[PDB]
From a paper:
One of the crystal forms of DEL-III was also of interest as it crystallized in a cubic space group. The reason for this is related to the fact that position 100 comprises the additional arginine residue. Numerous phosphate anions, present in the crystallization condition, can be modelled, including several at crystallographic special positions (corner of the cube at the threefold symmetry axis), which act as crystal contacts that help to glue the crystal together. These phosphate positions are contacted by the guanidinium tips of three pairs of arginine side chains (residues 97 and 100); each pair is projected by a different lysozyme molecule within the crystal. DEL-I and DEL-II also bound HyHEL10 with a similar affinity, which represented at least a three orders-of-magnitude decrease compared with HEL. In contrast, binding of HyHEL10 was essentially eliminated altogether in the case of DEL-III.
We have solved the crystal structures of two of the three isoforms of lysozyme purified from Pekin duck eggs (DEL-I and DEL-III). The duck egg lysozyme structures have the basic fold of the C-type lysozyme characteristic of HEL. In general, the duck isoforms contain approximately 20 amino-acid substitutions (of 129 positions) relative to the chicken enzyme, and were thus considered to be likely to maintain essentially the same fold.
Residue numbers in the entry: 1 to 129
Write the structure that this text describes.
Amino acid sequence: KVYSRCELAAAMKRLGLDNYRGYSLGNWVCAANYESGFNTQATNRNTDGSTDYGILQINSRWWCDDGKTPRSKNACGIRCSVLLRSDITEAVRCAKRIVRDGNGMNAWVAWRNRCRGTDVSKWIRGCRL
């Protein structure tokens, strides 16, 4: 599923991400934009044999099981395929765990790159929620 910006904002709001560990909703929408273009089916392969999955490009070395990544630690306890589904419930649950790991949203390089230190409220402008 490719979400629209406001559809995703509303879904993430409903699933409890707004101000999760102090990160306002716009942070999460912005991160998703730059990680995956709002596409739950996005995948990106890396040189350690890992792959990033889904709308928040969650990595298979550390966070999910894709059956083909050496030294995987699958800390979210999920098959990476669940992160390709249209329903983002499981992706959000994993993202919450990631952001409890100790680095906050620094876990998402696209967030560091394009969202950190910007007015992230623009990402929820115009949305009904």
